[PDB]
Amino acid sequence: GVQVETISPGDGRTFPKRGQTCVVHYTGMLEDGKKFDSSRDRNKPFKFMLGKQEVIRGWEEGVAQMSVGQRAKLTISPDYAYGATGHPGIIPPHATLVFDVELLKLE
Amino acid sequence: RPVTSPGQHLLAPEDVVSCCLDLSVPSISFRINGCPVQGVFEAFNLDG
Amino acid sequence: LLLQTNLINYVTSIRPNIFVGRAEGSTQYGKWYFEVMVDEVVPFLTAQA
């Protein structure tokens, strides 16, 4: 399950569409609060296309609900996330994921 | 601990936070831009 | 097990010189009110919010 809570509002009209590239800044934490990823440390926005399946199910659906300029917290269950096998070294098995995502623009 | 207010958002410009302290209860309450914050601290220590 | 490292911002606290409390026989009023108005906030000046 994807669970979205607005940290800061966006425009409220412009929402991602399939085949539309989404540009985000994100910070990733496990449910316990440990951080495993952040685009800001790399100082480079992360770009992904919708419906393509580059990113996990949770990102797809959650960013689908967001708006341009919107900042949100996304809680993703393992089944939408990497799940039982996990991401070796980075993410343990059966890990709920917390993400802080700012949807900068659509291109 | 998440707390519910109208128009929830992290503190932004042009935002006014009203803080009220009642030492009798004791209780601490908040209002955001004139709107109640649906959460309160209470039953805390009064040693200082 | 292993020690963890990350970059964090410094944080500072500022107070007025108002001190209120409650004690038996105190000459001091219990209920108090103040406000804080935000003028300018940069969400991400660094990677950390």
UniProtKB/Swiss-Prot annotation, chain A:
Subcellular location: Cytoplasm, Cytosol; Sarcoplasmic reticulum membrane
Domain PPIase FKBP-type: 19-107
Subunit structure, as described in the record: Interacts with TGFBR1; prevents TGFBR1 phosphorylation by TGFBR2 and stabilizes it in the inactive conformation. Interacts with ACVR1B and SMAD7. Identified in a complex composed of RYR1, PDE4D, PKA, FKBP1A and protein phosphatase 1 (PP1). Interacts directly with RYR2 and RYR3. Interacts directly with RYR1. Interacts with GLMN; rapamycin and FK506 abolish the interaction with GLMN in a dose dependent manner.
GO CC terms: cytoplasmic side of membrane; cytosol; intracellular membrane-bounded organelle; ryanodine receptor complex; sarcoplasmic reticulum; terminal cisterna
Root EC class: isomerase
Lipid bilayer topology: Peripheral membrane protein
Classification via Pfam families: FKBP_C
Tissue occurrence: Detected in fast twitch skeletal muscle (at protein level).
PTM annotation (N6-acetyllysine): residues: 52
Superkingdom to which the source organism belongs: Eukaryota
Residues where N6-succinyllysine is found: 52
Its job: Keeps in an inactive conformation TGFBR1, the TGF-beta type I serine/threonine kinase receptor, preventing TGF-beta receptor activation in absence of ligand. Recruits SMAD7 to ACVR1B which prevents the association of SMAD2 and SMAD3 with the activin receptor complex, thereby blocking the activin signal. May modulate the RYR1 calcium channel activity. PPIases accelerate the folding of proteins. It catalyzes the cis-trans isomerization of proline imidic peptide bonds in oligopeptides.
Record's catalysed reaction(s): [protein]-peptidylproline (omega=180) = [protein]-peptidylproline (omega=0)
EC number: 5.2.1.8
Activity regulation, short description: Inhibited by both FK506 and rapamycin.
One GO-annotated biological process of the protein: regulation of release of sequestered calcium ion into cytosol by sarcoplasmic reticulum
Family: Belongs to the FKBP-type PPIase family. FKBP1 subfamily.
Keywords, comma-separated and alphabetical: Acetylation, Cytoplasm, Isomerase, Membrane, Rotamase, Sarcoplasmic reticulum
The protein's name: Peptidyl-prolyl cis-trans isomerase FKBP1A
One Gene Ontology molecular-function label: peptidyl-prolyl cis-trans isomerase activity
Curated annotation (Swiss-Prot), chain B:
Record's comment on post-translational modification: The N-terminus is blocked.
Tissue: Detected in skeletal muscle (at protein level). Fast- or slow-twitch skeletal muscle.
Outcome after substituting residue 33 to D: Impairs interaction with FKBP1A
Subcellular location: Sarcoplasmic reticulum membrane
UniProt record similarity statement: Belongs to the ryanodine receptor (TC 1.A.3.1) family. RYR1 subfamily.
Function recorded in the entry: Cytosolic calcium-activated calcium channel that mediates the release of Ca(2+) from the sarcoplasmic reticulum into the cytosol and thereby plays a key role in triggering muscle contraction following depolarization of T-tubules. Repeated very high-level exercise increases the open probability of the channel and leads to Ca(2+) leaking into the cytoplasm. Can also mediate the release of Ca(2+) from intracellular stores in neurons, and may thereby promote prolonged Ca(2+) signaling in the brain. Required for normal embryonic development of muscle fibers and skeletal muscle.
Oligomeric form and interacting partners: Homotetramer. Can also form heterotetramers with RYR2. Identified in a complex composed of RYR1, PDE4D, PKA, FKBP1A and protein phosphatase 1 (PP1). Repeated very high-level exercise decreases interaction with PDE4D and protein phosphatase 1 (PP1). Interacts with CALM; CALM with bound calcium inhibits the RYR1 channel activity. Interacts with S100A1. Interacts with FKBP1A; this stabilizes the closed conformation of the channel. Interacts with CACNA1S; interaction with CACNA1S is important for activation of the RYR1 channel. Interacts with CACNB1.
Extra remark: Binding of [3H]ryanodine indicates that the heterozygous channel is activated by Ca(2+) concentrations 4-fold lower than normal. Single-cell analysis of cotransfected cells shows a significantly increased resting cytoplasmic Ca(2+) level and a significantly reduced luminal Ca(2+) level.
Gene name of the record: RYR1
UniProtKB/Swiss-Prot annotation, chain C:
Subcellular locations according to the entry: Sarcoplasmic reticulum membrane
Highest taxon in the source lineage: Eukaryota
Tissue note: Detected in skeletal muscle (at protein level). Fast- or slow-twitch skeletal muscle.
UniProt PTM comment: The N-terminus is blocked. Channel activity is modulated by phosphorylation.
Spans annotated as Interaction with FKBP1A: 40-49
UniProt record similarity statement: Belongs to the ryanodine receptor (TC 1.A.3.1) family. RYR1 subfamily.
Functional note: Cytosolic calcium-activated calcium channel that mediates the release of Ca(2+) from the sarcoplasmic reticulum into the cytosol and thereby plays a key role in triggering muscle contraction following depolarization of T-tubules. Repeated very high-level exercise increases the open probability of the channel and leads to Ca(2+) leaking into the cytoplasm. Can also mediate the release of Ca(2+) from intracellular stores in neurons, and may thereby promote prolonged Ca(2+) signaling in the brain. Required for normal embryonic development of muscle fibers and skeletal muscle.
Record text on subunit structure and interactions: Homotetramer. Can also form heterotetramers with RYR2. Identified in a complex composed of RYR1, PDE4D, PKA, FKBP1A and protein phosphatase 1 (PP1). Repeated very high-level exercise decreases interaction with PDE4D and protein phosphatase 1 (PP1). Interacts with CALM; CALM with bound calcium inhibits the RYR1 channel activity. Interacts with S100A1. Interacts with FKBP1A; this stabilizes the closed conformation of the channel. Interacts with CACNA1S; interaction with CACNA1S is important for activation of the RYR1 channel. Interacts with CACNB1.
UniProt name for this protein: Ryanodine receptor 1
Lineage: Eukaryota, Metazoa, Chordata, Craniata, Vertebrata
